[PDB]
Amino acid sequence: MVEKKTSVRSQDPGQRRVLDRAARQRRINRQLEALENDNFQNFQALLEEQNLSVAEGPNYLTACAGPPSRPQRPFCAVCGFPSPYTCVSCGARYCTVRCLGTHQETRCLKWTV
Amino acid sequence: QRIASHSHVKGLGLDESGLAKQAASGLVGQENAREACGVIVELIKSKKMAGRAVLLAGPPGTGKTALALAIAQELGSKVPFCPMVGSEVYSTEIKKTEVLMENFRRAIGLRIKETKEVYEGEVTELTPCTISHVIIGLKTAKGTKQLKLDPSIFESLQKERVEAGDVIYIEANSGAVKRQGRCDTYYVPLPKGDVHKKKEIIQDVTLHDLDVANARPQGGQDILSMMGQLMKPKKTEITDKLRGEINKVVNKYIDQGIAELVPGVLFVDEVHMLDIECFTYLHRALESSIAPIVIFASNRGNCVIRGTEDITSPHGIPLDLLDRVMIIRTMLYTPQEMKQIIKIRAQTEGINISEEALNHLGEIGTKTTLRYSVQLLTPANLLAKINGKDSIEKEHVEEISELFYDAKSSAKILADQQ
Amino acid sequence: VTRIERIGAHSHIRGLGLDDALEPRQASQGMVGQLAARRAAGVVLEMIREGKIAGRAVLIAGQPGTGKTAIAMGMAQALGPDTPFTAIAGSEIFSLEMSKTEALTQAFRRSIGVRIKEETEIIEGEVVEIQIDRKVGKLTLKTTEMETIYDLGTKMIESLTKDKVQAGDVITIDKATGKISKLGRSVQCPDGELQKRKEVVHTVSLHEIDVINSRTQGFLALFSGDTGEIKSEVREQINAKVAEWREEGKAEIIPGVLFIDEVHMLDIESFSFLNRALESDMAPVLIMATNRGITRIRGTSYQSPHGIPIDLLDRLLIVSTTPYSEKDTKQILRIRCEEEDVEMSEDAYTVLTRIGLETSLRYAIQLITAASLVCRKRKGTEVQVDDIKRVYSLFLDESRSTQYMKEYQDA
């Protein structure tokens, strides 16, 4: 019987309109907070009492180390192995053609809303 | 690895009393000649004489090269031993006499211990302080150290384009900088030892190497830059000026105990190939107080000297130079000795031989030169191997000797002469 | 259509035609008859391939034209590539930029290979975009299966500046050097992975090591601007450093062959040098060829077999090649015809066989092509007997030419 996906024709990328630059940052930020996030897959109270804690003296906010001297290393994000490549659209890194395939099908451009 | 014609010779094979054994460190037979070589080898170890000369004489194949190599083995690696062919003196860049003198100087060695240190690591910082000095931080797997560096060295750093994160090997005494790469984390591994490496290099040099290093200048950045570009032939050093001055500085360091002289050997093969002007230079040269011991080898008897076109002399060497030389005669082997040599060569070369195969191969060695019996072993073993056998059965030697002829048999074939 | 290499005297020799018991097929791989000598060549060829024994010497002797250079080329072709086979004539060592002894040792050391196995990683793709911010930039590369961005750091962007201001080029980047090489305008773009780890097995002669390390930019091995390497120093420590590469995993040595054709042209200085040059671990096998009988050695007045001094003939094994019968002559002529484009009548083969068995083999082999052309003139398609007779009249051989000196000319 039929190929049975032309009915849903999800992506149909004649009008793809890549997401880039600041959008990448958004994704990065999102991922960071998700790795910093909690059980559900009080934080507002934490942010409130943290914004009470703002000052120039030695405190929570001023105890951040900062950027590292040893430069950032590439990793694949699909299997986590060292990654010679970058995805042209979103900037996330990968190490094979197969990994680019999976990434294009599940993580490239799809979760930027 | 890689067996060679003499690689079974492990020494002269004398005992503690001097007298030669029938078979020893690779060598078998040549009782009297090995005894004579054993006497001169202690002349070499004495480090006392200069320019003493020996002629290993005899027919081709009678072990004379083997005895010279046995001397070289008997001494070890701590004293020089320079192989030359008399044919090598006919240089096209350099006058024969100067090839000969250079080889006389290759054969005198000089041991010298330098306790020396090099600083290596990933450079963490550089700060020059008109520059009074440069502070440089170096990192290895055993920590970090802050170095103060002579400001002249600060030129080298900029010439090598070193900057923080590079791995470098700044040498303490020279001040020489070599940029080994970029550090692994950004390429070469972070050095895994201490940042201040210190070691006593006890490696040795020779007088000729010194002469050559003093023949031509280095660096300069002026007109000299173009001297770094032209074709670089060898040229004669100056007898009564440069190489004598080298003698002076070497004596200065010997007096200080920094260096120790190790007089070696110059071994000249096929000495009959030297020109008569070479022979006469040579017998003006090995009377010098600085010369090595020189071992000559010649495999032809009474015949005409080179470059005279009619003067005939024993061993192809003028009577003048045959005086002031001690002659060691080597002689032809008996069938028993040739059998032993064939056996030693076989077991050196990795070959198994059946007793009847060995006996007939030795008999071949009686109809024909020993060296030919020794030739046949490997191809005969290769046939045996290709017939699936481990040993050389007689079926293989007594048939491989039909594929390959020897000099005499092939000469008899050539006697059809058309 | 026509490449550099064309039909030469030994083109038909595709190998040394032996069964793997080292037994010669009476006609195989272009080689005919000559059984004893060819199987002896087989033994020394397997001894070459074993490699464990250094500095062995074989002399292959016989009349002119009795297959001895053909046997040498058969060994070369049977040995195949990636094992050095340095072929020179005895006349090659007589030189003006270096001495004959030095040229001979250089020939010895072109003939030992060092096999060194190295892993790099190579990028290969079509350029999609490139950037410059006067400096840093970025590069996007495309294989038909993927595209990626790279950051153009200082050395990489400097390297890419060498032949810039174009895009859509399909190029390779060596991540070691930054060496860019471009195949052309997107010739098709590449398949598979963009960046791959890759292995190269370099085989480099000892002469090449020695030359590269003789001098700053000493790699003029391309034009022989070296004039005698510094032996015992820049040549003793290369031997030591190769012995250090070995027995550690860095490299393995591949001992090849040195073929000295017409060794009777060497002189006793050169022969005396061979005596000792054959006796070191780094000595290859050398095989050498000679027509001459018992003749005067060059450089002296001494008569000797093969024109080679006897103390060197002690040092080598002497193969003898033998002259050909009618059958072997006919078969060689057939194989030459099959290597060239010609076809002949069987009567033409018979006539040419007797012609070559009368005068000399090589003359008949030469007549093949001439008769082919003569038949082409009359727009034939197979060489006939009268073509051979015509060509036999047009082109003389040495014997009939000498006979025709019943008239007189200069001396």
Ligand SMILES: Nc1ncnc2c1ncn2[C@@H]1O[C@H](COP(=O)(O)OP(=O)(O)O)[C@@H](O)[C@H]1O
């Ligand atoms: N006394 C010995 N014991 C064992 N093997 C020997 C002895 N003398 C010679 N040989 C072997 O026989 C060969 C004869 O060659 P060689 O001695 O170099 O000739 P020459 O004496 O003319 O230099 C040597 O290369 C060596 O392999």
Ligand SMILES: Nc1ncnc2c1ncn2[C@@H]1O[C@H](COP(=O)(O)OP(=O)(O)O)[C@@H](O)[C@H]1O
């Ligand atoms: N056994 C053989 N098989 C094939 N061709 C041969 C054979 N012997 C000689 N030839 C050919 O005959 C000609 C004679 O040359 P060649 O035998 O190399 O001369 P030489 O033996 O004097 O070196 C060449 O064209 C060669 O290819």
